[PDB]
Design a protein around this nucleic acid. Structure first.
Ligand SMILES: [K+]
Ligand SMILES: [K+]
Ligand SMILES: [K+]
Ligand SMILES: [Mg+2]
Ligand SMILES: [Mg+2]
Ligand SMILES: [Mg+2]
Ligand SMILES: [Mg+2]
Ligand SMILES: [Mg+2]
Ligand SMILES: [Mg+2]
Ligand SMILES: [Mg+2]
Ligand SMILES: [Mg+2]
Ligand SMILES: [Mg+2]
Ligand SMILES: [Mg+2]
Ligand SMILES: [Mg+2]
Ligand SMILES: [Mg+2]
Ligand SMILES: [Mg+2]
Ligand SMILES: [Mg+2]
Ligand SMILES: [Mg+2]
Ligand SMILES: [Mg+2]
Ligand SMILES: [Mg+2]
Ligand SMILES: [Mg+2]
Ligand SMILES: [Mg+2]
Ligand SMILES: [Mg+2]
Ligand SMILES: [Mg+2]
Ligand SMILES: [Mg+2]
Ligand SMILES: [Mg+2]
Ligand SMILES: [Mg+2]
Ligand SMILES: [Mg+2]
Ligand SMILES: [Mg+2]
Ligand SMILES: [Mg+2]
Ligand SMILES: [Mg+2]
Ligand SMILES: [Mg+2]
Ligand SMILES: [Mg+2]
Ligand SMILES: [Mg+2]
Ligand SMILES: [Mg+2]
Ligand SMILES: [Mg+2]
Ligand SMILES: [Mg+2]
Ligand SMILES: [Mg+2]
Ligand SMILES: [Mg+2]
Ligand SMILES: [Mg+2]
Ligand SMILES: [Mg+2]
Ligand SMILES: [Mg+2]
Ligand SMILES: [Mg+2]
Ligand SMILES: [Mg+2]
Ligand SMILES: [Mg+2]
Ligand SMILES: [Mg+2]
Ligand code: NA
Ligand code: NA
Lengths: 68, 49, 128, 144, 197, 96, 229, 145
RNA sequence: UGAAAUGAGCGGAGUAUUUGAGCUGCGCACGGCGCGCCGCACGCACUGGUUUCUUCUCCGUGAUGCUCCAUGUUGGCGAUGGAAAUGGGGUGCCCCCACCCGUCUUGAAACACGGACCAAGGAGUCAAACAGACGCGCAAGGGAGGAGAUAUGGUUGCCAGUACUUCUCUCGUACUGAAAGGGAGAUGCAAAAUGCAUCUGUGGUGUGCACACGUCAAAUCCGUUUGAUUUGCCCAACACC
RNA sequence: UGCAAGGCCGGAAAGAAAAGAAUUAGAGGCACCAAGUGGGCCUUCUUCGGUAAGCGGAGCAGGCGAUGCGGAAUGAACCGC
RNA sequence: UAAGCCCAAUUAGUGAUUGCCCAUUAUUCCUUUGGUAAGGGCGGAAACAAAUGGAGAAAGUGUAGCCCUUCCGAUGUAGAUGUGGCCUGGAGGUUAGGACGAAGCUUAUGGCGUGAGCCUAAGAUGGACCGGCCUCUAGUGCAGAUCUUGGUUGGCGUA
């Protein structure tokens, strides 16, 4: 007793009922893991300094607000 | 088709129907037909000469 | 007491919805059952078959539950039950329970006449 | 209660939600965890990775009692100090004494910032917990 | 007929009544349903929606979390203005990791006994949602807050743990079991810890 | 068939314009029953009592191009035993 | 006699009544003036074109008419057996039901859309009478998601909240002349739901030039729709 | 302590006074002017209430709960009997003194009480005439003390 | 059948106002010839003029009605009766429709299987482990269980219940390593192979309710509301570190 | 002071002109828990084996299955709906 | 002299552009039901006895739906879910009925509900128990399984 081997019938209809969802935007899930390591290492040094600058900047703003 | 609704949506509709009555007046229609043909024919002759 | 006047009762359908082929079997009662057979002509909505009940047959909400007399039927079991219908006596009529006996029915019929409370199954000779 | 189960809703439905085609048969996949590597492999592989195989050294006759070692962090120490003693506790003065092994703990771990300085009696202490409690005015005393 | 393919997929599961059997919850829903429709405030509408929510969707909040976000708002707030009333549609639980807290006015459905003691001992006051409606009928000068749910153990189990990039906990009573094949590179393969999305 | 509307052919009415003249006219089908039942003027005019009965309707619109007319009867539908039988088409309500 | 809260309501309601009547009179005057202005614009525009045609004819020239900017499209087929490409276009045209009708701009992006669904829709170039009849008799607005028949000019003003669209004649003028608010007016309307054409069609399966119905009929669409509105 | 709003939530679905007979929800509440099972008409439940009741003869009695002795049930309800012939608006004004939101139903109930008393005398008189022409085999007479 | 008649329609006034159609001024457009000349079917502006004919135009009633029901005319029948009506029920008849149910199956009215009748019986249950949704209690803690104590050392029974207790046990507040074994705060100062200081504090960044400052738009019964947006803080979350 | 990267501070922003110069019955994203199903079949165009088949096997898309109704006298799938 | 085939029309060289008939389609009117539903009202306005305008007005998922206005959808096997949705035997409550007749049974007994069913009437039936509502509980609903047991039955006054 033989049966049907293969068909793609109704598959495109099934894939479009809940639609084919679009891709995630570029600004989301933009992990740099696995990229070129020498550029990754240098970027980490800059990001560490940027966090320190952000912490200090909030300290100045808090003092400035309390100044008035 | 309704009188109230047409006037409510278009307050100007009374003037439009008054104009329509004038064009369907037999004397107005016949006088206009004579005048329109004479003035168009005169303009056609002048343009071609 | 006369009932409150309402709009005319429509009653979309008078015939009952009866079981498929219940006339051919003494076992089967006429009570409606949804036909779930795969090849059932009633379930498949064939032209000459019985209809199946659905939400479209629902009656007008203004005239729903109203009896032909114009009242609504409220079950009552004793004399004290008549006082629940004193104010709304043009809307509701009392239905004496079947099991209430003849001795107790005399008091209920006597009291309802003085209160002008309509009894759906009360004394026929009274109220003319 | 029986009146809330799906059986009552399925009275008159014949197949009771199992279908006319596939039906409700006895054991269509095998019994229990049968075929974990044959015909049930995908379910085992994606939901229970690591299920099959061996790992590690054996420990015959394990006794959990010699291995008893509950831990408490430095920032949870106020759970064992009475309210009236915590208010009176301050660096440089008299501090409450906490017996860890009588409260069900064996090791002071030392996560977070300590809220009230105190003297902690413990069987074990992490190297960071000992350093932090001493800088905050408390101390650790070893017990057994 | 009208072509309306997939129109049912546009509809959303929106609940209007509560499943709660608590009569005092129903009283609060009755009060704030009135306020959400007779006032213009967006606070009353949000509070009314959260009262209908299930218990799982009203996560509890720690007392330390309230004090931290209050301090982030206390700075950059003028000394003339008073501190807002912290409002949470849920439970407030005490935090033993933070002993010194400022005086705050907190409104919640329920306070734990320790949390109520800690708020009062710091000079604050534990408010009730019917009290809040009388002092802040439109929610003026309030700090609406929500509890955390991303740390729940149910969330940590969601998804398949065997697919690459996944770090959910499997359903297993024995911790030692389910550790050999599929979790170590030595035993056949290891589930990949990272996957680009 | 839909029995709420009936088709009536009238002698000498063989055009749609002819049938339009009868739109609105009262239509009567006359038969008899088995027993003498109530009628109009049962007590006023006892001579009217008879087994004769009448069902009354009206012409709603013409049908086709050959003078056929559509008739709707009062409330109920005309019996199928009236098929092939005489239908009376009166001249009232008059428009002349 | 009367409660205080019921007394303040009376004065506020009395002032609401006075202002409502004033707004009704103000809108009636505004709609009158705009309808007169449009009426003369339409009459003069056709008179200008008649002279232009006469001048070209007298000297052996030709007058090329402006390409129509507005098309009126009605669906003439049911909802059965529609391919996904044709299904989506009719959805974007809001032609989800047979004898549904919309007004569209006859530009290149829309024309290529209409060519793809030609067997399903009969379309052409509407006249001023056709646009007026559809707006006045079959005109509905999308108010709060509801299909509301246009019964007075205040709804048009409140729906569009635009200076240039306050009355029915503003609505007709935007559609007929393809104004800058053509999309705003047409989008704000519910898709027109028309009756079947009295007198029947010819053949819904063939193109109009084949003796059928589904093609572009040019200005013959007005005769088709006159039996439908 | 426990307001009417809380009490109504507790007893709306299950109460001694609620009668759901044949799909109709009525009330035996002696302090209900209507028989409708609503929070407004629940005289036994509200802090203040008033119900129009019949009295001996054609008199109309107004029973009032003023909300001062709710914790003392034998003093909760006070009766004031109006002389026969009282205007229905006067009865409604007495009720409105306690419950202004019951003024309309109290007026209608005051009118119905007067109508019933007149009908009761008319029906009883007709019954007496019928009984006067009938010979009864038995006649019970309650003993006096 | 006027229980709020919104009317070009009802009611008050007025004898006119302004729609076209004819005829017309200036300028500009447009057409023809090649600089400004001619034409202009009568387009735009002056809401041009003209009044020859063609139209009627101007005001007017909120709900102090939250909701439902309740108000004509002319005959026929019905004046209390084995009655007059309307509805329901029963049987026959006419014209139209109308394949036998349940099942497996792509496909059943099937020359596919089970089907003489009726009554009574007849099939997702109980227990254990886990998980998710929802209800409830408490909450960094939750809760037993076994057992004991005494109201009860009492009562045929109610009472095999209810009330009370636990330095225990268990699940969590900490996780990792095969194990030996280790074991998680922030900021600042600084770079000590366990560095110091402080303790009211989201580690940072982007997107992000409410709330607070404004700032626009629309509508207002002029009290406001309802949208958008700036700035601050951003809760819950998501994404990079 | 040039390139690379992460930020900060400002400026400008028909919020996208005009050229036929889009449209939308245009709330996007994120989850959790589960059922049936996993024998298909028929048609339009394309198409492989076979002399062919109401034969076997595929692509795209509709449909029957799961659905009657109005038509082709009659027909699961044709026409209309 | 088609009632056949090809073509072409709509009362016909007259005066302009809809001959006619059939749908579970379209338009529109009425009613139901459900929404990702959209809005209003809900602080009793004032006045008003009977004999001789009325009634209601619940801050509300779901009921006889709190009332009113408005818009849109409604078929469906396998399957999911919801229902102040229906029914049965028992339990904790509450409120009733019965020798002037309970349960059961009988029906051209009608009424109500879209329905599951509920209720009344009659018995020229019966002879002692039992209804409603809230909650709890389970051996809880039958047309078919060559289903089980009992009885009956056409074949048949036949072989
Ligand atoms: K096994
Ligand atoms: K229902
Ligand atoms: K047997
Ligand atoms: Mg095959
Ligand atoms: Mg297969
Ligand atoms: Mg019925
Ligand atoms: Mg089938
Ligand atoms: Mg009986
Ligand atoms: Mg069955
Ligand atoms: Mg099913
Ligand atoms: Mg299932
Ligand atoms: Mg299976
Ligand atoms: Mg193998
Ligand atoms: Mg080994
Ligand atoms: Mg955590
Ligand atoms: Mg045709
Ligand atoms: Mg085709
Ligand atoms: Mg007039
Ligand atoms: Mg020139
Ligand atoms: Mg009437
Ligand atoms: Mg009369
Ligand atoms: Mg036949
Ligand atoms: Mg088979
Ligand atoms: Mg087969
Ligand atoms: Mg079959
Ligand atoms: Mg065969
Ligand atoms: Mg078989
Ligand atoms: Mg215990
Ligand atoms: Mg853990
Ligand atoms: Mg270890
Ligand atoms: Mg849109
Ligand atoms: Mg097969
Ligand atoms: Mg199979
Ligand atoms: Mg509807
Ligand atoms: Mg009053
Ligand atoms: Mg409710
Ligand atoms: Mg359905
Ligand atoms: Mg049992
Ligand atoms: Mg009972
Ligand atoms: Mg009988
Ligand atoms: Mg019978
Ligand atoms: Mg029952
Ligand atoms: Mg059973
Ligand atoms: Mg049986
Ligand atoms: Mg058998
Ligand atoms: Mg025999
Ligand atoms: Na199948
Ligand atoms: Na509705």
């Amino acid at each position: 007793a033989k049966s049907k081997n293969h068909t793609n019938h109704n598959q495109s209809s099934k894939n479009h009922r809940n639609g084919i969802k679009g891709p995630v935007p570029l600004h989301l899930h933009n992990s740099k893991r696995g990229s070129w390591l020498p550029a990754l290492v240098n970027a980490r040094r800059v990001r560490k300094h940027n966090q320190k600058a952000a912490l200090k900047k909030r300290r100045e703003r808090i003092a400035a607000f309390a100044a008035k | 088709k309704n009188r109230r609704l047409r006037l409510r949506l278009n307050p100007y509709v009374k003037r439009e129907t008054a104009a329509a009555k004038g064009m369907r007046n037999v004397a107005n229609r016949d006088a206009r037909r004579k005048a329109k043909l004479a003035r168009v024919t005169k303009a056609k002759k002048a343009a071609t000469k | 007491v006369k009932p409150t006047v309402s709009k005319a009762i429509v009653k979309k359908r008078t015939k009952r919805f009866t079981r498929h082929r219940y006339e051919l079997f003494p076992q089967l009662s006429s009570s409606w059952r949804k036909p779930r057979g795969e090849d059932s002509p009633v379930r498949r909505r064939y032209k000459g078959q019985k209809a199946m009940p659905n939400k479209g047959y629902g009656s007008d909400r203004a005239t729903k539950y109203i009896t032909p007399s114009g009242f609504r039927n409220f079950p009552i079991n004793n004399v004290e039950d008549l006082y629940m219908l004193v104010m709304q006596n043009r809307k509701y009529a009392g239905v004496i329970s079947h099991t209430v006996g003849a001795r107790k029915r005399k008091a209920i019929v006597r009291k309802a006449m003085e209160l002008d409370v309509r009894l759906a199954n009360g004394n026929a000779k009274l109220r003319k | 209660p029986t009146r809330f189960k799906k059986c009552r809703h399925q009275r008159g439905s014949t197949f009771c939600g199992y279908g006319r085609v596939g039906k409700h048969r006895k054991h269509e996949s095998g019994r229990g965890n049968a075929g974990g590597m044959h015909h049930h492999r995908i379910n085992f592989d994606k939901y229970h990775p690591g299920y099959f195989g061996k790992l590690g050294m054996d420990h015959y006759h394990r006794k959990k009692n010699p291995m008893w070692k509950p831990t408490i962090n430095l920032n949870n120490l106020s759970r064992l100090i009475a309210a009236e003693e915590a208010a009176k506790a301050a660096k440089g003065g008299t501090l409450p004494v906490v017996d860890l092994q009588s409260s069900g703990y064996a090791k002071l771990l030392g996560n977070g910032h300590i809220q009230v300085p105190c003297i902690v009696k413990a069987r074990y202490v992490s190297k960071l917990a000992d350093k932090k409690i001493r800088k905050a005015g408390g101390a650790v005393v070893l017990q057994a | 007929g009208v072509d309306l393919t997939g129109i049912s997929k546009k509809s959303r599961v929106i609940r209007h009544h509560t499943y709660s059997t608590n009569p005092y919850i129903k009283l609060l829903i009755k009060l704030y349903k009135f306020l959400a429709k007779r006032t213009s405030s967006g606070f009353n509408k949000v509070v009314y929606q959260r009262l209908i929510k299930s218990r799982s969707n009203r996560a509890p909040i720690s007392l330390s979390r309230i004090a931290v976000v209050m301090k982030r708002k206390a700075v950059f707030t003028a000394k003339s203005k008073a501190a807002p009333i912290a409002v949470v549609v849920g439970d407030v639980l005490d935090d033993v990791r933070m002993a010194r807290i400022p005086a705050m006015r907190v409104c919640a459905l329920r306070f734990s006994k320790s949390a109520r003691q800690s708020i009062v001992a710091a000079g604050g006051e534990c408010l009730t949602f019917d009290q809040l409606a009388m002092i802040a009928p439109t929610g003026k000068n309030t700090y609406l807050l929500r509890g955390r749910k991303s740390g729940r153990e149910s969330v940590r189990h969601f998804g398949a743990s065997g697919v690459p990039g996944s770090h959910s906990k499997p359903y297993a009573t024995n911790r030692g079991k389910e550790t050999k094949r599929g979790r170590r590179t030595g035993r056949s393969y290891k589930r990949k810890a990272f996957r680009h999305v | 068939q839909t029995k709420q509307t009936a088709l009536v052919r009238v002698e000498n009415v063989n055009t749609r314009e002819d049938a339009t003249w009868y739109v609105g006219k009262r239509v009567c089908y006359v038969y008899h029953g088995k027993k003498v039942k109530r009628c109009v003027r049962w007590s006023k005019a006892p001579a009217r009592r008879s087994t004769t009965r009448a069902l009354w309707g009206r012409v709603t619109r013409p049908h086709g191009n050959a003078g056929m007319m559509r008739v709707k009867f009062n409330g109920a539908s005309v019996p199928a035993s009236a098929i092939g039988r005489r239908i009376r088409v009166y001249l009232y309500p008059s428009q002349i | 006699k009367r409660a205080a809260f019921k007394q303040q309501q009376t004065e506020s309601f009395k002032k609401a009544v006075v202002a409502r009547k004033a707004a009704k009179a103000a809108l009636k005057k505004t709609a009158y003036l705009r309808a007169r202005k449009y009426s003369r614009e339409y009459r003069g525009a056709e008179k200008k074109l008649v002279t232009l045609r006469r001048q070209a004819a007298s000297h052996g020239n030709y007058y090329l008419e402006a390409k129509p900017k507005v098309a009126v499209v009605t669906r003439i087929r049911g909802i059965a057996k529609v391919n996904p490409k044709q299904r989506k276009i009719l959805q974007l045209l809001r032609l989800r039901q047979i004898f549904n009708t919309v007004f569209v701009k006859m530009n290149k992006p829309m024309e290529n859309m209409l060519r793809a669904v030609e067997p399903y829709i009969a379309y052409g170039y509407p006249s001023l009478a056709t646009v007026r009849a559809m707006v006045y008799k079959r005109g509905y607005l999308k108010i709060n998601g509801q299909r509301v028949k246009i019964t007075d000019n205040q709804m048009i003003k409140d729906k569009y909240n635009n200076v240039d669209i306050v009355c029915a004649e503003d609505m007709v003028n935007q559609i007929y002349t393809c104004g800058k608010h053509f999309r705003t007016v047409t989008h704000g309307m519910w898709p027109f739901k028309l009756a079947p054409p009295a007198g029947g069609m010819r053949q819904k399966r063939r193109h109009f030039v084949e003796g059928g119905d589904y093609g572009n009929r040019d200005t013959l669409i007005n005769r088709f729709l006159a039996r439908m509105i | 302590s426990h307001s009417v709003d809380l009490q109504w939530v507790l007893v709306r679905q299950n109460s001694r006074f609620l009668q759901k007979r044949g799909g109709i929800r009525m009330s035996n509440d002696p302090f209900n002017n209507n028989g409708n099972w609503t929070k407004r008409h629940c005289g036994f439940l509200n802090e203040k209430a008033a119900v129009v009741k019949p009295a001996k003869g054609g008199a109309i009695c107004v029973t009032v709960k003023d909300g001062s002795s709710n914790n003392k049930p034998r003093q909760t309800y006070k009766k004031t009997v109006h002389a026969a012939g009282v205007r229905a608006s006067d009865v409604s004004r007495a009720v409105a003194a306690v419950r202004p939101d019951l003024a309309d139903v109290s007026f209608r109930r005051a009118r119905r009480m007067a109508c019933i008393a007149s009908r009761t005398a008319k029906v009883a008189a007709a019954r007496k005439a019928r009984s006067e022409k009938i010979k009864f085999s038995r006649k019970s007479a309650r003993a006096k003390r």
